[PDB]
Amino acid sequence: GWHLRDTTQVPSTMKVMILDSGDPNGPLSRAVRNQLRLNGVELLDKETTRKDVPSLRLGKVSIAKDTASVFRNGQTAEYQMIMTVNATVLIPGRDIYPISAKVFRSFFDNPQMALAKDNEQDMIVKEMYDRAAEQLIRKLPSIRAADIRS
Amino acid sequence: ACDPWWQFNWCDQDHCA
Amino acid sequence: LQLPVGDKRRSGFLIPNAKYTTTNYFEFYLPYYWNIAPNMDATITPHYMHRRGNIMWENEFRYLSQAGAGLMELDYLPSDKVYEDEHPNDDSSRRWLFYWNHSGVMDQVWRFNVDYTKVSDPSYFNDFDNKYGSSTDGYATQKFSVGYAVQNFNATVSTKQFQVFSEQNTSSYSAEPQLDVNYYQNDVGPFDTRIYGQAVHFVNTRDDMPEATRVHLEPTINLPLSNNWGSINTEAKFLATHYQQTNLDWYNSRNTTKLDESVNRVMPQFKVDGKMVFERDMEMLAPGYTQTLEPRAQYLYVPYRDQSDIYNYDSSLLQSDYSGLFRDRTYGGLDRIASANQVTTGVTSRIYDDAAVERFNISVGQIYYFTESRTGDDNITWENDDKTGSLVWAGDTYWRISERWGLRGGIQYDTRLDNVATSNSSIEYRRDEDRLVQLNYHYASPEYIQATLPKYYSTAEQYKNGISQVGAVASRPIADRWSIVGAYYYDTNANKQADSMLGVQYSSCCYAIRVGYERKLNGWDNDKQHAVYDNAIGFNIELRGLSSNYGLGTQEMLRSNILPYQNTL
Ligand SMILES: CCCCCCCCCCCCO[C@@H]1O[C@H](CO)[C@@H](O[C@H]2O[C@H](CO)[C@@H](O)[C@H](O)[C@H]2O)[C@H](O)[C@H]1O
Ligand SMILES: CCCCCCCCCCCCO[C@@H]1O[C@H](CO)[C@@H](O[C@H]2O[C@H](CO)[C@@H](O)[C@H](O)[C@H]2O)[C@H](O)[C@H]1O
C-alpha cells in the first residue's frame, strides 16, 4: 500500500519560524537555515513583532574525536567522530520541546599524510553538521504530535 | 591558443578525434 | 591553604594522588591550586617519578576572556635516567610538553581557534600520563585559525603543522599559511550561487622536498526544486587551480615523471541529485506505525585531467560509507581530483511509531561507474583490475529497540578488494548514566589496509593483518554509593588483548575515592617482533560538598582508557 508522501516534511504549523542561536554565523546555524529553506520554511528575526510563530533555538554543539580501534602496536587505526546537537522548539503559549541529534562518522588515520587527513577531517565535520540539521528537521513532526495529545 | 583554454571543455584530456 | 576544592575555592594544596605503573614504577602528584582572579586559575603539580628518579613540574592555566576560553599546559622534566640510558649520545635528557587549546567566538563575527601540541621527543606519550595526548596518537597537531564570518560570507586564515612521531618517514607537509573564502547568494533568479576560494603555501620539514603555492577558485550554481514527496537539485561547478612548485630538483632526479614548476588545472563538474519519498501504514507490526521508503539517485560527471605533474600535498582517499556514497569528491584537498562518470543509487527505509518518532532505519546503496575514475597518477594497489560497474556498496542501520536498547551497524564493500572493506557493529543497553552494557565490533580487511595505507603498513607485522576488534564495556552501581566499571577490548586476529580497564569509585557526601587499573597496548618491540603492554594502578581522592556534583563518576571512568566509551543510545 505504498503511496507518495502527501504531507510536508515540516508541519504546516511551522511553515513560518524564528531561528535563534548564540552563533548565528556558525556552521550549524548555516546548515539548519539551508535545510529549512529547502523545505519552504519562512524564517523571521528574533525581534519580529509577529506572534503565534514557533521558535527554534539551537543549543550547544559537541564534537568529539576518539580512537575506535588500534593496531597491534597500540597506535590509532580508526577515529570515531561524534557530533551531538541540542535544540529546543518553543510553541508560543503551549510549551517548549527539546530535541537532539547525534551523528557518527569514522575515518582511518595516516600520519604520513597527516595534513591530508586534517583536511579530510574538516570535510567530515562539514558533512556532519548537514546530517545533524536533517535529523532536527526529521524531529519536527513528532513535536507537532506532542502538541496535539497535550 | 588552445593550451590553457581547452581546460574549460567537457571532454577528457586524451579525447578529441 | 590545606585541602581546598580545585574548582573555584581559595588557593591551596589539593589532595595528593599516587599510582604505580610499569613505565615509571611509583608516581605521586602533589597539586597546588591557585585562583588568580575570576576566569583565571592555575595548577602547579610536582609529579615525582621513581623509575626516572626525578620530579616533573606540570603547570596548568585556565582562562576565560571575551576572545573565548583557553587552557595552557606546560610539563617539564629536567632529567630522565631512562631516556638517558636509552639515548646516551644526546647532550641532555630533559622532556617537555606544551599544549594550548583556545576556542572563542567574539562579537558573533570573529572566530579564534588554537589547537597546539608540541613534545620534546616522539616517545613522550608512551612514557607519561595521557591527559592532553595519548599513546595511540601518531602525531601532534599545531593549528591556529582566525576567521571572520557573517551570514553570507566568511574568510579564515589558518596555519597547520604536524610533528610526526613514527620514525619511518618524519617528513610532513604544512600549510603556512592557508586562506579560505566562501561567498553565497541565494536569490539569483531560481538559482543559488556560491564561490569558494583558497590560497595555500605548502612547505615540508625536509629541505629537499618540493614546496608549493596553490590558488584555487570554485564557482558553483545550482537549481533546487522540491515537492511534498520528491526533490531534484542540479549543480554546475568550475574548478580552477594554479600551482607554483619549487625545489623540484631532488624529486625530478629520482622519479621518471616530472613535476612542473607552473601548472594550470581547470575542469567543469556536473551533478544531478534526486530524492523521492513513499509512505505506508504498517498495521501488521502495530497500528499507527508508518514506514517510509526513500529512493535517492545521483549522476556525477567530471572530465579527466592528467595530474601527474602535481605533487600530492594534502589529498587522501576518503572512506565511502552510505552518506559518503553521494559525495562528489574521491579525495580530500585539491591536489587529486578524480574524473567521474558515475551514478549512485541508494534507498533508505525508516519506521516511525504512532508518536511520529523514528524507531528504525536502514540504508543500502551502490555506485556504478560508466568509465574508470582516474587522476593520471594511479598507484592504489587493488586486488583486481575492475574499473567499471558496481564497484562500491555501502549499508547502514540503526534500531532503537526500546528505551534502553540500541543497535547500530555499518558495512562497506568494494569489489576491487574482493572482500568487505570495513564494518562496524554495536549493541548497547543503558538504563541510565550508571547502569550500562555495550558490545562493539570493528573490522577492516587487510586488503583495505594495503590499498589505502603505505606499503610498509601492508608489510609490517603490526599493521598488515587489518583490524578485527571486539570490545565489551560495562558499569553498575551498588548501594547508591559504589560504582564498578569494566572494559575489555580484544583482537581476534592475534588472539591477544588490546585494552583492559577496571574502576571502583566510592562516593560520599563530602569526598570521593576512585581506584583505577588499566592494561593497554603501548608500543612495539622491533627486536623480538611482539607488542609491548603497559600496566597502571592508581588511586585518587576528590573533595565533594561544595558543588551539586552528586554523580558516582561512572562516565568519567568510562573515558579513562585508550579506547574510551561512547554512548550509542
Ligand atoms: C545493510 C545493513 C546495515 C549493515 C549491517 C551489517 C553490519 C554488521 C556487520 C558487521 C559485523 C560482522 O562483520 C563481519 O566480520 C566478519 C568476521 O570477521 C568479516 O569476515 C571475515 O571473516 C574472516 C576473518 O578472518 C575472513 O576469512 C573473511 O574473508 C572475512 O570476510 C566480514 O568481512 C565483516 O563484515
Ligand atoms: C566487561 C569488563 C571486563 C573487565 C575485566 C577485565 C579486567 C581484567 C584484566 C585482565 C587481567 C589481568 O591479567 C593480565 O592479562 C592476562 C591474563 O588474562 C595475562 O596475559 C595474557 O594475555 C593474553 C591475552 O589477554 C592471553 O591470551 C595470554 O595467555 C596471556 O599472555 C597478563 O600477564 C595479565 O597481567
Numbering used by the authors:
A (entry chain B): 1000 to 1149
B (entry chain C): 1 to 17
C (entry chain A): 216 to 784
Task: Quote the study that presented this structure, word for word.
LPS biogenesis systems are essential in most Gram-negative bacteria, with LptDE responsible for the delivery of LPS to the outer leaflet of the OM. The outer-membrane associated β-barrel is made up of 26 antiparallel β-strands (β1−β26). These β-strands are connected by turns on the periplasmic side and extended loops on the extracellular face that fold over the lumen of the barrel and require rearrangement to allow LPS molecules to reach the external surface. LptE is tightly bound in the LptD β-barrel.
Binding modes were described by cryo-EM, resulting in 8 high-resolution models of SfLptDE in complex with Bicycle molecules at 4 different binding sites. To confirm the SPR competition binning, four additional cryo-EM data sets using different Bicycle molecules were collected from competition bin 1, which had the most unique sequences. The resulting models showed that all four Bicycle molecules bind in the same region and with very similar binding mode as Compound 1, indicating that the SPR-based competition binning can effectively be used to sort molecules according to different binding locations. All five imaged molecules (Compounds 1–5) in this epitope had an aligned sequence contacting the β-barrel of SfLptD, with a ubiquitous W×(D/EE) motif making a consistent interaction. In each of these interactions, the Bicycle molecule tryptophan indicated was docked into a hydrophobic pocket formed by Pro483, Phe485, Tyr516, and Pro518 on LptD, with further stabilization coming from hydrogen bonds formed by the guanidinium group of Arg520 and the hydroxyl group of Tyr516 contacting both the amino acid backbone and the side chain functional groups of the D/EE residues. The remaining residues of the five Bicycle molecules aligned poorly, especially in the regions facing the detergent micelle. Overall, this indicated a level of motif specificity in Bicycle molecules binding to SfLptDE, despite the relatively small interaction surfaces, demonstrating this high-throughput screening process did not select for merely nonspecific detergent-binding molecules. All Bicycle molecules had a protein binding face and a detergent binding face, with protein contacts being stabilized mostly via hydrophobic interactions. Overall, the backbone of SfLptDE showed little rearrangement upon Bicycle molecule binding compared to the apo conformation.
